[PDB]
Design an enzyme around this catalytic site. Structure first.
Site, PDB file in Angstrom:
ATOM      1  N   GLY B  11      82.478  11.274   4.159  1.00  0.00           N
ATOM      2  CA  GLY B  11      82.495  12.193   3.044  1.00  0.00           C
ATOM      3  C   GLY B  11      81.069  12.531   2.654  1.00  0.00           C
ATOM      4  N   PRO B  12      80.890  13.356   1.623  1.00  0.00           N
ATOM      5  CA  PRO B  12      79.550  13.745   1.173  1.00  0.00           C
ATOM      6  C   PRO B  12      78.660  12.543   0.833  1.00  0.00           C
ATOM      7  CG  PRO B  12      81.166  15.183   0.209  1.00  0.00           C
ATOM      8  CD  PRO B  12      81.940  14.042   0.846  1.00  0.00           C
ATOM      9  N   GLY B  14      75.911  10.484  -1.384  1.00  0.00           N
ATOM     10  CA  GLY B  14      75.713  10.386  -2.821  1.00  0.00           C
ATOM     11  C   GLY B  14      76.919  10.052  -3.678  1.00  0.00           C
ATOM     12  N   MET B  15      78.038   9.678  -3.058  1.00  0.00           N
ATOM     13  CA  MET B  15      79.233   9.342  -3.826  1.00  0.00           C
ATOM     14  C   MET B  15      79.329   7.842  -4.079  1.00  0.00           C
ATOM     15  SD  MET B  15      82.440  11.567  -2.412  1.00  0.00           S
ATOM     16  CE  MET B  15      82.440  10.934  -0.590  1.00  0.00           C
ATOM     17  N   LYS B  17      79.506   5.662  -1.151  1.00  0.00           N
ATOM     18  CA  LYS B  17      80.246   5.134  -0.006  1.00  0.00           C
ATOM     19  C   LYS B  17      79.676   3.795   0.449  1.00  0.00           C
ATOM     20  CE  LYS B  17      79.618   8.540   2.805  1.00  0.00           C
ATOM     21  NZ  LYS B  17      78.547   9.183   1.983  1.00  0.00           N
ATOM     22  N   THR B  18      78.359   3.743   0.620  1.00  0.00           N
ATOM     23  CA  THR B  18      77.692   2.526   1.071  1.00  0.00           C
ATOM     24  C   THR B  18      77.845   1.345   0.106  1.00  0.00           C
ATOM     25  OG1 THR B  18      76.048   3.786   2.338  1.00  0.00           O
ATOM     26  CG2 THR B  18      75.485   1.514   1.753  1.00  0.00           C
ATOM     27  N   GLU B  34      75.146   2.046   7.765  1.00  0.00           N
ATOM     28  CA  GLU B  34      74.382   3.270   7.952  1.00  0.00           C
ATOM     29  C   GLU B  34      73.198   2.875   8.843  1.00  0.00           C
ATOM     30  OE1 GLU B  34      71.928   4.958   4.532  1.00  0.00           O
ATOM     31  OE2 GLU B  34      73.572   6.403   4.794  1.00  0.00           O
ATOM     32  N   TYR B  52      65.118  17.358   5.116  1.00  0.00           N
ATOM     33  CA  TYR B  52      64.972  17.983   3.811  1.00  0.00           C
ATOM     34  C   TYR B  52      63.692  18.813   3.673  1.00  0.00           C
ATOM     35  CZ  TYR B  52      69.201  15.605   2.195  1.00  0.00           C
ATOM     36  OH  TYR B  52      70.520  15.229   2.030  1.00  0.00           O
ATOM     37  N   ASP B 108      80.378   2.927   8.390  1.00  0.00           N
ATOM     38  CA  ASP B 108      79.757   3.822   7.440  1.00  0.00           C
ATOM     39  C   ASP B 108      79.699   5.110   8.299  1.00  0.00           C
ATOM     40  OD1 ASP B 108      77.962   5.299   5.785  1.00  0.00           O
ATOM     41  OD2 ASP B 108      77.035   3.432   5.102  1.00  0.00           O
ATOM     42  N   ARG B 109      80.686   5.978   8.094  1.00  0.00           N
ATOM     43  CA  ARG B 109      80.833   7.263   8.777  1.00  0.00           C
ATOM     44  C   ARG B 109      81.409   7.266  10.195  1.00  0.00           C
ATOM     45  NH1 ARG B 109      78.907  11.250   5.705  1.00  0.00           N
ATOM     46  NH2 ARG B 109      77.293  10.749   4.140  1.00  0.00           N
ATOM     47  N   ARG B 162      75.225  10.487  -9.512  1.00  0.00           N
ATOM     48  CA  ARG B 162      75.099   9.443  -8.485  1.00  0.00           C
ATOM     49  C   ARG B 162      74.116   9.846  -7.400  1.00  0.00           C
ATOM     50  NH1 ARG B 162      81.028   6.530  -7.649  1.00  0.00           N
ATOM     51  NH2 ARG B 162      81.215   6.043  -9.888  1.00  0.00           N
ATOM     52  N   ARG B 166      71.264   7.760  -5.628  1.00  0.00           N
ATOM     53  CA  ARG B 166      71.402   7.371  -4.224  1.00  0.00           C
ATOM     54  C   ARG B 166      70.527   8.087  -3.189  1.00  0.00           C
ATOM     55  NH1 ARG B 166      76.513   5.937  -5.135  1.00  0.00           N
ATOM     56  NH2 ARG B 166      76.653   3.999  -6.356  1.00  0.00           N
ATOM     57  N   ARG B 168      68.055   8.897  -0.323  1.00  0.00           N
ATOM     58  CA  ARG B 168      67.527   8.125   0.795  1.00  0.00           C
ATOM     59  C   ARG B 168      66.034   8.421   0.950  1.00  0.00           C
ATOM     60  NH1 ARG B 168      72.570   7.310   0.283  1.00  0.00           N
ATOM     61  NH2 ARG B 168      73.800   6.336   1.957  1.00  0.00           N
ATOM     62  N   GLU B 171      64.592  12.036   1.227  1.00  0.00           N
ATOM     63  CA  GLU B 171      65.573  12.988   0.715  1.00  0.00           C
ATOM     64  C   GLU B 171      65.060  13.786  -0.488  1.00  0.00           C
ATOM     65  OE1 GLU B 171      69.545  11.435   0.327  1.00  0.00           O
ATOM     66  OE2 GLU B 171      70.191  13.031  -1.038  1.00  0.00           O
TER      67      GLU B 171
HETATM   68  C1  LIG Z   1      75.299  11.406   8.888  1.00  0.00           C
HETATM   69  C2  LIG Z   1      74.273  12.388   8.353  1.00  0.00           C
HETATM   70  C3  LIG Z   1      73.592  12.201   7.187  1.00  0.00           C
HETATM   71  N1  LIG Z   1      72.688  13.088   6.736  1.00  0.00           N
HETATM   72  C4  LIG Z   1      71.958  12.810   5.463  1.00  0.00           C
HETATM   73  C5  LIG Z   1      72.672  12.978   4.099  1.00  0.00           C
HETATM   74  C6  LIG Z   1      71.973  11.988   3.120  1.00  0.00           C
HETATM   75  O1  LIG Z   1      70.848  12.596   2.453  1.00  0.00           O
HETATM   76  C7  LIG Z   1      71.551  10.792   4.002  1.00  0.00           C
HETATM   77  C8  LIG Z   1      72.591   9.645   4.066  1.00  0.00           C
HETATM   78  O2  LIG Z   1      73.859  10.137   4.545  1.00  0.00           O
HETATM   79  C9  LIG Z   1      71.201  11.408   5.406  1.00  0.00           C
HETATM   80  C10 LIG Z   1      70.389  12.666   5.615  1.00  0.00           C
HETATM   81  C11 LIG Z   1      72.423  14.212   7.413  1.00  0.00           C
HETATM   82  O3  LIG Z   1      71.604  15.036   6.998  1.00  0.00           O
HETATM   83  N2  LIG Z   1      73.040  14.469   8.576  1.00  0.00           N
HETATM   84  C12 LIG Z   1      73.940  13.643   9.100  1.00  0.00           C
HETATM   85  O4  LIG Z   1      74.501  13.882  10.176  1.00  0.00           O
END
Ligand SMILES: Cc1cn([C@@]23C[C@H](O)[C@@H](CO)[C@@H]2C3)c(=O)[nH]c1=O
Ligand SMILES: Cc1cn([C@@]23C[C@H](O)[C@@H](CO)[C@@H]2C3)c(=O)[nH]c1=O
EC number: 2.7.1.21
Lengths: 313, 307
Positions: B11-12, B14-15, B17-18, B34, B52, B108-109, B162, B166, B168, B171
């Site tokens: 899922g998205p 920042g919810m 999950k971890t 993760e 980012y 985790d995913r 959240r 959360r 990373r 980010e």
């Molecule tokens: C699995 C996955 C996560 N990410 C991101 C979203 C969050 O910022 C963070 C933790 O999930 C990491 C950068 C992504 O960009 N592409 C992806 O395939």
């Protein structure tokens, strides 16, 4: 159930694979043998713009020091994804139709290249050329689709001098270093299949590398003459000197995918008709499969023709 | 043969999950975390920061859509490697559908996060071509029996709070990306139901333009692929892309989706997740030694790539 013969003609560009393939197909009935061409239109237009030109221009700029290794890698990696998409998608839709290994086949599909060309071979050669990272090459390897039964791959042999003379015909650019790298990669590929089929275990022989081709015949090759040798890169090793597990698992996947393939070598150092008849003779010792449904044959046939019409040059 | 229960928490971002999964795991249950170390060091340097920063540069007009897409595409390959290689080595050990499981593997995913969801979200952010997204889709591994995927539910404002907590390493708080990823996962859940209820994307495709009970195709992932880059001059989707959608449909239809309400305390989220397992699908493994091997794989992954 009717039987199917799938034959993937692969190997370095410039040997005469495309011509040989069409000549072979021209011999049979437009009904019982179909050609799946290089998806040139996908590479030049549908997937992105002039991808072949982009790949060669990118390596050129890198060689000239106009862009960094990092810049080259992001561009090459993305380009390689575009290059392999038609192969991957075709494999994915064909998969459900292939049954177990099995008179002449009800249908023969001759492919210009197998998914490993774009998911393994060209990426590995670009890594040797400095335009791709070994981690990215292994990510592509981890994504290679499960090897379907009856995967016959014909690789080509041609003396380097003759190859260089052929190649020089003309978005490509004459890169002899890249030619050497791709010829080496396909040579290692052939040896890797033989190594695995002779019972070779990469994890057992990994230490035989530390101190710095026939695909279906001959003795077992040394691991140093297989694709495994390419992944002894410092980027892939932990402080303790061993390979990180994530990369070791990718080599386990490489072993699994290649070990079940049926590889043959075609000598391209002869006339076009000669290459055709030599391939035809090779086709006799290849593995056929049953198909899963009654209508699988017409469906597969339609898929190949649609692919050729839409993406063939 | 012994039974296995695989649960992919997705899922998205920042919810929570971890955090929730951790509190859940804390010998018959193992957690594949993760792979942050792969993202920050092993596969490449600071991939998250790279992702980012690239979008930010695109948004500011410092680089073109074209330059951004090549970066996002290459970065997504790095992001998904741990999931892909893990699925590939685990696959041969999974048997058919099958008391409690001998082993419960919580991830985790799932591979689709990196091969479908994030690429689709970046496409919506203008930083990935739809052709690249479909190329990743075509590489989604065959869906094996017992693929239970838990997706999250959380009101947007709460999610934003959240998310701010959360973040990373590398980010950037991007609300446009938060909306894009929330939309993609929402479309994903709808798509699975659409398919399970018999929806045929080829049959309903005309509804996207020409204006049992199931979601309208316009509320599924299929709607994202009515992208002009994928269409011929006459408006027809090229066959190569239609084939990738056929792959998408095959991969998603057999997944078992479960929704976890994250709008509660970590302990509540943890218990809810545990409640969801009663309806999950278990499978047998293929060999006597599969269980021990799976455990080793999971522990080794965590130790090597987990934060
Ligand atoms: C699995 C996955 C996560 N990410 C991101 C979203 C969050 O910022 C963070 C933790 O999930 C990491 C950068 C992504 O960009 N592409 C992806 O395939
Ligand atoms: C399959 C494949 C081909 N190529 C090249 C080699 C030839 O120049 C031409 C025709 O095959 C095209 C650019 C590549 O670079 N990467 C690949 O995955």
């Amino acid at each position: 159930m009717p039987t199917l013969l799938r034959v993937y003609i692969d190997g370095p560009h410039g040997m005469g694979k495309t011509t040989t393939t069409q000549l072979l197909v021209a011999l049979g009935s437009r009904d019982d043998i179909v050609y799946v061409p290089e998806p040139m239109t996908y590479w030049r237009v549908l997937g992105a713009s002039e991808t072949i030109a982009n790949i060669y221009t990118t390596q050129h700029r890198l060689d000239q020091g106009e862009i960094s290794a990092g810049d080259a890698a992001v561009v090459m990696t993305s380009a390689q994804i575009t290059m392999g998409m038609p192969y991957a998608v075709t494999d994915a839709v064909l998969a459900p139709h292939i049954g177990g290994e099995a008179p002449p086949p009800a249908l023969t599909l001759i492919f210009d290249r197998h998914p490993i060309a774009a998911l393994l071979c060209y990426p590995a050669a670009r890594y040797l050329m400095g335009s791709m990272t070994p981690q990215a090459v292994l990510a592509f390897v981890a994504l290679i689709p499960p090897t379907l039964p009856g995967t016959n791959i014909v690789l080509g042999a041609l003396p380097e001098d003759r190859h260089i003379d052929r190649l020089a015909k003309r978005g490509e650019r004459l890169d002899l270093a890249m030619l050497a790298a791709i010829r080496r990669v396909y040579g290692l590929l052939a040896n890797t299949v033989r190594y695995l089929q002779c019972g070779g275990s990469w994890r057992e022989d990994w230490g035989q590398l530390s101190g710095t081709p026939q695909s279906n015949a001959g003795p077992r090759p040394h691991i140093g003459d297989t694709l495994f040798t390419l992944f002894r890169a410092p980027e892939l090793l932990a402080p303790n000197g061993d390979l990180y597990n994530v990369f070791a698992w990718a080599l386990d996947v490489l072993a699994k995918r290649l070990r079940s393939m049926h590889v043959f070598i075609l000598d391209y150092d002869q006339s076009p008709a000669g290459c055709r008849d030599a391939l035809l003779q090779l086709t006799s010792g290849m593995v056929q499969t049953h198909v899963t449904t009654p209508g699988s044959i017409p469906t597969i046939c339609d898929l190949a023709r649609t692919f050729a019409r839409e993406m063939g040059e």
